[PDB]
Design a protein around this ligand. Structure first.
Ligand SMILES: [Mg+2]
Ligand SMILES: [Mg+2]
Ligand SMILES: [Mg+2]
Ligand SMILES: [Mg+2]
Ligand SMILES: [Mg+2]
Ligand SMILES: [Mg+2]
Ligand SMILES: [Mg+2]
Lengths: 70, 225, 156, 67
RNA sequence: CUGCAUGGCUGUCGUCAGCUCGUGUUGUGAAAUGUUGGGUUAAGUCCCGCAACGAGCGCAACCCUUAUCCUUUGUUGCCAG
RNA sequence: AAGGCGGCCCCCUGGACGAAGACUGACGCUCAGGUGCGAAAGCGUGGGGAGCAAACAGGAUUAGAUACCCUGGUAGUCCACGCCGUAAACGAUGUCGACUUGGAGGUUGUGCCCUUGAGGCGUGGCUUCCGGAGCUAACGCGUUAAGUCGACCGCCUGGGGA
């Protein structure tokens, strides 16, 4: 991403904008999974393990609204 | 009275959302309305009248009717109506084993007899004020939970449940003992643990006021024999 | 008054941080020579306390059986978790031809002539429940006539 | 949000449109996921094909950097 | 001599906070609940919810001094006047 | 169908689902023996080979390490034509038909109402999570059942030996 800083802009805010752009692009987070070979078996296992937790959280959110006042 | 017009004007016909309806109580459904169920007055009124007839008959039989309800909106009502009909009530959370573990209920009943007589005996003298106020709270909070069943003797002869779905444990205990039950069930309740089924709304100030006004009146109705 | 027989006593034990602790479980069956019969399962630290605890629960859980004058009405089968009991009526003088925990429960239920056979796991704890459920589910001529609308003479 | 294609009754999506299609690609040339766009699964699979067609025909860059 | 026969006594874990029982309930059963979960505390201390309800040894208090004030008695002590 | 399939385009083609129809008329289910397909690894011939990587060498750890940590590295993984029918080939749940409370979704089509906004009511196919009766030794299944039955095939009879 091009983060060419214009005039009258502090280096601090310029670097923060660059870091935010990198974070929203998610380039740094992709190397931690592209650094090694994940077998298709392992990838599918991770995907289902993440899907199971992803609606289990919503299931618990919608189920904890019945009892347990505080 | 038993008036369907009174029930409709109070708001008994309302129920709960259609996603919580119990599948075993649909004959008592008038039809969905904005994802909210509506009960049947044409079916609620006759069953309620028959239950009131049986209740006043069993009251003339000199039976100990116990009201039980832990709702916060109908908290003071089930007490002001139980005092009117000269009967017994439980208003706080149902202590599991109140009916089955009657030996320990009587033991607690006598604990809050010795402690009750402590107030008369001015025994708040053989101990300083910290001792005295601790004992004062020990009766205050011990009475505010089981005070409606102090002068009751043994097990009640009939039960009247404000909401069967919430107080399902009391339904089970009463069925195990062999005590007749008149429970106010709703669209999300289970009308299978009760021999007498009372359809209609269960969480409404006006609805519970009408129910209590009918029950207490018929109980005094039967007592005056 | 009422007759009672305890069938088997066990020596179940638990394990704790400081070792293993012991306990006793007693199975008893109570009856009165008639259709009333019940079973109880008490748990205590010693055999007399266990049997005395089981007796009270048996008495409070007694159930009624529509037996005949000296036998049962019709052959029946009872299916529990691990026990499959099959009982059938017999004639005068045959006796109670049953084994395991079924003999005691039949004797306290009052049936004098009966032939019983158990298949599966013959443990007393399960076979007692199996035979109690089989005896409680049997029908009588009067009950079947009432439920069908016919008469006992018609359905003979 | 809501599927604007269904809201406006857009039956088909053509790669030749760029002014109203750039809204579905990030500044890095990556496709905005459905969980962020608010688009149905019927039209996400057609938006992806249109974006791929535009990338092939040099209408939308694959990424910010190419050379 | 034998604390590898013991009584009595003592130290540590540790004034750490847990250790159990009665009834009831649940599971065919071994067994579980109570004792778990949120707040809170020094704590199984208190509350709420929850088939749990209660009880014992238990966490505190009741025991001994200090900290404001009252009365009684005034010697071997105080000198307000 | 299973195994398994992921930029885009072109050509051939199999299968699946829906409103309203028309048409033959039991032509329907299963199926020993047989036939075909069938992960990867492996073998033969002809090619290619960037990266990865059995065997192999070296380095490191360890009392020892013919291994896990590292640097290389051939077969192989890439293509065409041939051989095997082997997997935890799993949903450890065979194929087909009917019935049995409910809730919250995903995907796909259609009907209707004023569609002013994925407004509202219905209706079929696939699929996902709870959950009642019931079943089970219990975990658990639970309208896609492991609930009750019907038709058929295959398999099981103590653990080793095997
Ligand atoms: Mg807590
Ligand atoms: Mg291969
Ligand atoms: Mg290597
Ligand atoms: Mg080496
Ligand atoms: Mg298999
Ligand atoms: Mg076939
Ligand atoms: Mg389920």
């Amino acid at each position: 991403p091009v983060i060419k800083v214009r005039e009258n802009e502090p280096f601090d805010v310029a670097l923060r904008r660059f870091k935010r752009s990198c974070e929203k692009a998610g380039v740094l987070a992709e190397v931690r999974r592209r650094e090694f070979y994940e077998k298709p078996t392992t990838e599918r296992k991770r995907a289902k393990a993440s899907a199971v937790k992803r609606h289990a959280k919503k299931l618990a959110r919608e189920n904890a609204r019945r009892t347990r006042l505080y | 009275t038993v008036s369907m017009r009174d029930m409709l004007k109070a708001g008994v016909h309302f129920g709960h959302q259609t996603r919580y309806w119990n599948p075993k109580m649909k004959p008592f459904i008038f039809g969905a309305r904005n994802k909210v169920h509506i009960i049947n007055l044409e079916k609620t009124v006759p069953m309620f009248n028959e239950a009131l007839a049986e209740l006043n008959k069993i009251a003339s039989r000199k039976g100990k009717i116990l009201f039980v309800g832990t709702k916060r909106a109908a908290s003071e009502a089930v007490k002001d109506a139980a005092l009117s009909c000269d009967q017994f009530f439980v208003n706080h959370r149902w202590l599991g084993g109140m009916l089955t573990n009657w030996k320990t209920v009587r033991q607690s009943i006598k604990r809050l007899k010795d402690l009750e007589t402590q107030s008369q005996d001015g025994t708040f003298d053989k101990l300083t004020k910290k001792e005295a106020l601790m004992r004062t709270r020990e009766l205050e909070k011990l009475e505010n939970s089981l005070g409606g069943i102090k002068d009751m003797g043994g097990l009640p002869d009939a039960l009247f449940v404000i909401d069967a779905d919430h107080e399902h444990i009391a339904i089970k205990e009463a069925n195990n003992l062999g005590i007749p039950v008149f429970a106010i069930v709703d669209t999300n309740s289970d009308p299978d643990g009760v021999d007498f089924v009372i359809p209609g709304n269960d969480d409404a100030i006006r609805a519970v006021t009408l129910y209590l006004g009918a029950v207490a009146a018929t109980v005094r109705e039967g007592r005056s024999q | 008054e009422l007759q009672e027989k305890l069938i088997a006593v066990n020596r179940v034990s638990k394990t704790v941080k400081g070792g293993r602790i012991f306990s006793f479980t007693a199975l008893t069956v109570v009856g009165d020579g008639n259709g009333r019969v019940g079973f109880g399962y008490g748990k205590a630290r010693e055999v007399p306390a266990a049997i005395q605890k089981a007796m009270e629960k048996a008495r409070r859980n007694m159930i009624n059986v529509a037996l005949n004058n000296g036998t049962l009405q019709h052959p029946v089968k009872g299916v529990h978790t691990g026990s499959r009991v099959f009982m059938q009526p017999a004639s005068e003088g045959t006796g109670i031809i049953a084994g395991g925990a079924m003999r005691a429960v039949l004797e306290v239920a009052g049936v004098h002539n009966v032939l019983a056979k158990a298949y599966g796991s013959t443990n007393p704890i399960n076979v007692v429940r199996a035979t109690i459920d089989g005896l409680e589910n049997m029908n009588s001529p009067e009950m079947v006539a009432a439920k069908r609308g016919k008469s006992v003479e018609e359905i003979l | 949000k809501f599927c604007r294609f269904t809201a406006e009754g857009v039956q088909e999506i053509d790669y030749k449109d760029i002014a109203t299609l750039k809204n579905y690609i990030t500044e890095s040339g990556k496709i905005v996921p459905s969980r962020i766009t608010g688009t149905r699964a019927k039209y996400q699979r057609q938006l992806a094909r249109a974006i791929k067609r535009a990338r092939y025909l040099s209408l939308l860059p694959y990424t910010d950097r190419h050379q």
